[PDB]
């Protein structure tokens, strides 16, 4: 049963990575899921010379926070390829 | 049993993706289902030089929110191929 | 048992799609069933240069809402091949 | 058991379709049964240049509403090959 | 058991159809039985240029309403080959 | 057991048909039995140019109503080869 | 057991038919037994130009009413080869 | 057991028929037994030109009423080869 | 067990018939036993030109009434080869 | 067990017959035993021109009444080869 | 067990017959035993021209009444080869 | 067990007969034992021209009454080869 | 067990006979044992011309009464080869 | 077990006989044991011309009364080869 | 077990006999053991011309009374080869 | 089960190490997980001549603290390739 | 078990005999053990011309009374090869 | 299970040793884990001519105290390759 | 178990004998153990011309009384090769 | 289980010995563990011409007292290759 | 189990003997263990011309009294090769 | 289990002997363990011309008293190769 659960989690991770790669100016990303108020970690590798709107960074936030049950939109930690802690709501300091 | 459930979910995802592709100015899309007040994530790849009405974007919203049980019309997150967080009801800020 | 249920649902979907295709100015459609106050989604692909009466759009609504148990006539979401959210009763805004 | 029930329902559907085809100016029809106050859907394809009486449209209504147990005569939805929602009792608006 | 019941019902239907065909000016008919106050549906194909008495149409009514247990004489719906809802007692309007 | 019962009923039907055929001016008849106050249906094919007494039509009535248990003499519906509802006691109108 | 009972009843019927045939001016008859106040049906084929006494018609009545247990002498229905309802006690009208 | 009983009854019938045949002016007779106040039926075929005393007709009555248990002497129905209901005690009218 | 009983009864009948044949002016007789106040039936075939005393007819009566348990001397019915109901005690009328 | 009893009874009968034959002027006799106040039947065939004393007829009576348990000396019925009911005590009339 | 008992009784009978034969003027005798106040039967065949004392006839009586348990000396019935009921104590009349 | 008992009794009888034969003027005797106050029977065959004392006839009495348990000296019945009931104590009359 | 007991008794008898034979003027004797106040029987065959003392006849009495348990010295019955009832204590008359 | 006991008793008897033979003027003796106040029997065969003391006859008495448990010295019966009842204590008369 | 006990007793007897033989002027002796206040029997065969002290006859007494459990020194009966009852304590008369 | 858990932990460690390596100026790192307020240890090997922001060091902290359930952001210990205890919140001294 | 005990006792006897033989002026002795206040018997064969002290005769007494459990020093009976009852404590008279 | 635990502990030890070796100026170290307030022992072999900060010695302390559950930062004992007890908090003297 | 105990006792005896032989002026001894206040027997064979101290005779006493559990030093009986009861404490008289 | 524990203890001993050997001026040492306030024994073989600080002897003490659970730092006994009881805290005298 | 215990005791004895032999001026010794306040026996064979201190005789005492559990130092009995009861504490007289 | 314990004890003994041999001026020693306040025995063989400090004799005492659980430092008995009871604390006299 645990093997089935971990395989399902890995397949979800692969599908999510493929979909977020299918976003235009992104060659690849790396998503990891955390299941206990859950949370998730996104490490986007943004393509150089490209920058999407805040309304589309929230698009990435809600894209990853929606397709998984119980993930609040404010619990996704978004980090680019070199620093750039964009989620100021988590790190409110 | 869990394998049957996941296969049924994947088949539903494939059928829904095919139907939403069968919408004219869309080559392909990517739907993911979230089952616990459920919710779903749609990442449409709109064809360039095409733009459908708001009454037909709500058509996509209700098309994905209807064919699955218990999905409210206000819980679908719609994102185009490059940002464009169209669903302002979820992100009411 | 679940396989039998899903096969029966798929066969019903295929038969319904064939019957709604057998309506004159329609080459093909795509029906999906939602079973919990149930609801259903219809994505008709109307033939160009053809337009049926409102009393025959309600014919499609009742045709899909009747042959399945417990589906109210006001819960069918009807969308043409390009937008055109015809069901104003669901989207009363 | 469920397979026996669905096969019996399909055989009833085929027999009913053959009998309603055996009505003169009809090449073929499409009946679907709904079992929970049940109801049924009839999509007649009337032959061009032919039109039967109201007392014989009620003949079709009672022909389909009688040979199945518990189907009230006012719950049959009758639609021709192109719109023409004839049953005004269901759609009393 | 259900297969035995359905085979017995089909054999009764065939025998009844043969007997009602054995009535003179009738090449063939189509009877269907409904078992829950039961009821039945008769679709007679009367031979052209022939018309039997009302006391012999009631002969058909009682012929089909008698050989089956519990069928009241007023619950048989009689329809000719083209409309002609003869049973005015059911459709008392 | 049900097969034995139906075979016994069919054999009784065949024997009764042979005996009623063995009545002189009758080439063949068709009897059907109804078992729940039971009743039965007789469709005699009287030979042309022949007509038996009322005291011998009651002979047919009691001949079919006697050889089967519990069948009252007033419950037999007698119909000739073309209409002629002779049993006025059932149809007292 | 039921097969044994029906075979015994058929053998009794055959023996009774042979004995009543062994009565002089009778080539053959047809007896049927009814078992629930039981009753029986006799269809004698009297030889032309022959007529037995009333005290010997009652001989036939008691001959068939005696050799079977519990059959009252007044419950036998006697019919000749063409009408002739002789038993006026049953049909006292 | 029932087969043994019926075979014993048939053997008794055969023996009784042989003994009553062994009575002089009788070529053959036909006895049938009725077992529930029981009763029996005798159909003697008296030889022409012969007639035995009443004290020897009562001999036949008691001969058949004695060799079987519980048969009263007044319950035997005696009929010759052509009518002649001799037992006036049963038919006291 | 029943077969043993019937074989014993038949052997007793044969022995009794042989003994009563061994009585001088008797070529053969026919005895039948009745077992429930029992009774028995004797059909003697007296040799012509011979007649035994009443004290030896009572010899036959007691000969058959003694060798079987519980048979009273007044319950034996004695009949010659042609009528002649000798036992006036049974038929006291 | 019943076969053993009947064989023992038959052997007793044979031995008794042989002993009573061993009495001088008797070629053969025929004894039958009756077992419920029991009784027995003796049919002696006395040799012609011979007659034994009454004190030796009582010898036969006690010879048959003694060698069997419980048989009273007054219950033996003695009959010669032609009538001659010698036992006047049984037939005291 | 019953076979053992009857064989023992027969062996006792044979031995007793041999011993009573071993008495001088007796070629053979015939003893039978009766077991329920028991009793026994002796049929002596006395040699002609020989006659033993009364004190030796009582010798025979006690010889047969002693070697068997419970047989009183007054219950033995003694009969010669031709009548001669010697035991006047049993037949005290 | 019963066979063992009867064989032991027969062996005792043989031994006793041999011993009583071993008494001088006796060629052979015949003893029989009776076991329920028991008793026994002795049939001595005294040699002609020999006569033993009364004190030695009592020797025979006590010789047979001693070697068997419970046999009183007054219950032995002594009979010579021709009558001669010597035991006057048993027959005290 | 009974066979063992009887064999032991017979062996005791043989040994006792041998010992009493081993007494001088005795060629052979015959002892029999009686076991229920028991008793025994001795039949000595004294050699002619020899006579032992009374104190040695009591020697024989005590020799046989001692080697067996529970045999009183006054219960041994002593008889010579020809009468001579020596034990006057038993026969005290 | 009983065989073991009897073999042990016989071996004791043989050993005792050998020891008493081993006494000088004795060629052989015969001892028998009696086991219920037990007792024993000794039949010594004293050698002619020899006579042992009374204190050595008591030696024999105590020799046989000691080596067996529970045998009192006054219960041994001593008899020579010809009478000579030496034990006057047992026979104190 | 009993065989083991008797073999042990016999071995003890043999050993004791050998030891008492090993006493000088004794060629052989014969000891027998009695086990219920037990006792024992010694039959010494003293060598001629030899006589041991009383303090050594008591040596034999205690030698046999000691090596066996529970044997009192006053219960040993000592007898020489010819009478000589030495133990005056047992025979204190 | 424990092997499955440790393999899952090792796979998580490998994936996390690969992702943190996929951060630009990092050739490799070494993560270890601690599961009981849990905690974790990170030993980054920063590439020479590179230094990321504090808002991206907190990016590493939250990247490792998010993808694992229940890890607070203040419990991650971050150490470079040579000392440099950057996390001053843990070591608040 | 009893065989083991007797073998152990015999081995103890052999060892004790060997040790007491190993005493100088003794070629062999004979010890027997008595086990219920137990006791033992010693029959020493002292070598001629040798005599040990009383303090060494008590040495033999205690040597045999010590090596066996529970044997009191005053219960050993010591006898030389010819009388000489040395133990005056046992025989204190 | 214990083998699995010890193998897991050894693998953790090996991984920790490899990671601490991966720290620059360290060729190898030796870690041992202690599991009951747990504690651990570190024996670092610092490379000559190298010395890291106190804030990086605390880096080693927290690196080993973090990756294992429940290890407080003050319970790690740190010793270089030659003495140098650096942890003054444990050894506070 | 008993065999193991006796073998252990014999091995202890052999070892003790070897050790006491290993004492200088002793070629061999003989020890026997007595186990119920236990006791033991020692039969030393002292070498001629040798005599050890009393403090070394007590050495032998304690040497044998110590190596076995529960043996008091005052319960060892010491005897030389010819009398010499040295232990005056046991024999305190 | 005990074998697993002892093997684990031996492996810990070997690893600890190797680590303490890996301390510079030590060729080999010998550690033994004591498990019940536990304790341990260290026998260091210090290399000649080398002497570490007291703060590094306490390093050895805590190195061995830390890597094993529950060992207090004051319970380790430290001894060099030749005496030199360094731990004065244990031996506080 | 007992065999294991005795083998362990023997191995302990052998090891102790070897160690006490390894004491310089001792070629061999003999130790025996006594287990119930236990005790032990030592028989030292001191080498001639050698004598150890009292503080080293107590060394032997404590050497044997220590390596075995529960042996008090005052319960060891020490004896040289020829007398010399050194332990005056045990033999305090 | 006991074999495992004894093997573990022997292995501990061997290891301890090897370690104490590894002490410089010692070629070999002999340690024995005593397990019930336990105790132990050490027999050191000190090398000639060598003498370690008292603080290193206490080193040996604590070296053997530490590596075994529960052994107090004052319960070790230390003896050199020739007397020299060094432990004055045990022998405080």
Residue numbers in the entry:
A (entry chain H), B (entry chain G), C (entry chain F), D (entry chain E), E (entry chain D), F (entry chain C), ...: 125 to 160, 171 to 227
Please share text taken word for word from the publication where this structure appeared.
A central part of the bacterial flagellar motor is the MS-ring, which is composed entirely of multiple copies of the FliF subunit. Major functions of this ring are to support the assembly of the switch and to stabilize the assembled motor. Starting at the N-terminus, each FliF protomer begins with a predicted transmembrane helix, TM1, followed by a set of domains termed ring-building motifs (RBMs). From the N-terminus, these include RBM1, RBM2, and RBM3, with RBM3 further divided into RBM3a, a ß-collar, and RBM3b.
All structures have an RBM2 ring positioned just beneath the RBM3 ring, with this ring termed RBM2inner. As in previous reports, we observe more than one stoichiometry for the RBM2inner ring; here, we observe 21- and 22-mers. The resolutions of these RBM2inner densities are 4.1 Å and 3.7 Å, respectively. The density begins at Gln-125 and ends at Gly-227. Although our model for RBM2inner appeared similar to the previous structure at a global level, the RMS deviation was 1.2 Å for Cα atoms, which is higher than anticipated at this resolution. The main positional differences were found in a long loop (residues Leu-180 to Gln-190) between secondary structural elements and at the termini. However, the overlay had a high RMS deviation throughout. One possibility is this high RMS deviation reflects the ability of RBM2 to adjust to different MS-ring diameters and symmetries. We also observed additional densities on the periphery of RBM2inner ring. We observe 11 regions of density, which we tentatively assign as an RBM2outer-RBM1 complex.
